[PDB]
UniProtKB/Swiss-Prot annotation, chain B:
This is Beta-ketoacyl-[acyl-carrier-protein] synthase III 2. It comes from Bacillus subtilis (strain 168). Keywords: Acyltransferase, Cytoplasm, Fatty acid biosynthesis, Fatty acid metabolism, Lipid biosynthesis, Lipid metabolism, Multifunctional enzyme, Transferase. The gene is fabHB. It is found in: Cytoplasm. Induction: Down-regulated by FapR.
Length: 325, 326
């Protein structure tokens, strides 16, 4: 029985846009090919000098300007990212540096594109257990700096952004209704970026440190995993799909989301995305989709939302939440 | 707000190659005597050229499993505290799942530097007490030798490689977690860092070369003023005195630093478990190693009250009062 609720949101995307017309001019592709395979038209790119922590701070500033309460109260900062400024100090510690909160834990977490829903799962457990009260769950990514822009199959997908969600103790009405998780470690060679190691199964990695994906195998894994766990979520919470107001999967690819929406029985018109003008922002994709929906009037207080973050690992966390703002 | 979690099993693995003080004498201008005096370390373990953090972690879960009476097939969460993961986003935790093939588990890497172990247990306690999980593996693993500058005598003598795992599960009888304290000093970020995508910090270009960098004096100063008062606050939160606590297990960064903390917090060094002498500074792993050294030696017994205090790069920390459930 959850004692946690999501009560504020903020997002920031860097100003520089990367259009398909800009991409036709550096790789051999076309606007029509891109929009047809992926659904994206633009992405935001961080400046040469602005990094993930800079984006996370902006995202929290946006939340700060839009939240009727105070953030001096925050007692945990969770930052889900893959493009941290430094190996350490962590990005969460950079956020604390800037706002100066006096008594908070700070932690970077890594589940790649599932990082946001992993972070919200963590906040739900930390609050519900009575260990925390105000927790900042932040996703921020600088995918442009680890993207192979010599590769037509991948450089058209990725953008930069950050988004922040505030979670609080709510003892009246639960804000988290159910959770599903799973990990398919066997898929680690299907979606990766090199680090200290440069081989997986004794097989040398490609990409020269940049992100690498087997798009079809990722697509196939999402398509065969999300529908059943979608159903399992609704069962765990005692809910029908008719009770579900919005479906917010990880915005990796509009066709993938369309496909998922057919294999699951769920309509695309009840599905929030952010892929068209921000590309695939990894752990930030879901926050962007939510804030676009908040700004557009589609997402309203007390609605039932299903966030399904999945990514590299392969791993995922699916969440049924009740909008609390 | 009573805890429903207890640490129930442990396993460790430290790499094979030993890096003695004598070895370091032929690498940089240092002496065995200056090292044992300034840091208390004699040996470190070094991973092989082709073994990495995920290898170490898997070896640590192997050790735990060969020592746990129950099964690990129903582990529902893997948390790996690491700063030196094999790959950027392929999660070390997911490499651990791939090896053992557990069927329904979350996998997540966490980064709080040398504080990652205590942060990972704090997470596990909240994840289990809230009823979202039943059995969690909290793993720390580091391959610091791969990110160490072996032309800097002030830093390359400090670090080693190791991995250690703790199992946390539901215990509705008696809590295994009694109190927690946390804190973050983001402005101390330039005191202990390693370059990632960025190579400047508030204006000034980073040093090293993607290798770990530490201001040992300032790290000493922080924590010497931080840990004693939070030590006491942990006891107050749990309703205990210094005499109720059996073992103190701080981050094994430096024996002089540990002795000094024990000096200005009122707590005796003979009641503190360390692992610096033969394993060096293994970052997030140092506490698990001190724990596993104490159980093998018969010093850490079940139901004993023990305080873990992980502090590290951030600067950030998590301190925990726990009851040994093994």
């Amino acid at each position: 029985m959850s004692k946690a609720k999501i009560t504020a949101i903020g997002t920031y995307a860097p100003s520089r846009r990367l259009t398909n017309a800009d991409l036709e001019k550096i790789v051999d592709t076309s606007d029509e090919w891109i929009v047809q395979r992926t659904g994206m038209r633009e992405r935001r790119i961080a400046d040469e000098h602005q990094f993930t922590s800079d984006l996370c701070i902006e995202a929290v500033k946006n939340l700060k300007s839009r939240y009727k309460g105070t953030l001096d109260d925050v007692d945990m900062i969770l930052v889900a990212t893959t493009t941290s400024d430094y190996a350490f100090p962590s990005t969460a510690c950079r956020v604390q540096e800037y706002f100066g909160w006096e008594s908070t834990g700070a932690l970077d977490i890594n589940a790649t594109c599932a990082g946001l829903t992993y972070g919200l799962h963590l906040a739900n457990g930390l609050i519900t257990s009575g260990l925390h009260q105000k927790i900042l769950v932040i996703a921020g990514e600088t995918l442009s700096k680890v993207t192979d822009y010599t590769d037509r199959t991948t450089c058209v997908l990725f953008g930069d952004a950050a988004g922040a969600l505030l979670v609080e103790r709510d003892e009246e009405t639960p804000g988290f209704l159910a959770s599903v998780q799973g990990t398919s470690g066997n898929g680690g060679d299907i979606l990766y970026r090199a680090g200290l190691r440069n081989e997986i199964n004794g097989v040398q990695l490609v990409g020269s440190g940049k992100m690498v994906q087997n798009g079809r195998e990722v697509y196939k894994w999402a398509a065969r995993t999300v529908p059943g766990e979608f159903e399992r979520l609704l069962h765990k919470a005692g809910l029908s799909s008719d009770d579900l107001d919005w479906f917010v999967p990880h915005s990796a690819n509009l066709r993938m989301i369309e496909s998922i929406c057919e294999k699951t029985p769920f309509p695309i018109e009840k599905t929030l995305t952010s892929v068209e003008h921000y590309g695939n922002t990894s752990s930030v994709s879901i926050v962007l989709a939510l804030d676009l929906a908040v700004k557009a009037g589609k997402l309203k207080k007390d609605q039932i939302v299903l966030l399904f973050g999945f990514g590299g690992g392969l791993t995922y966390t699916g969440l049924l939440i009740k909008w609390g703002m």
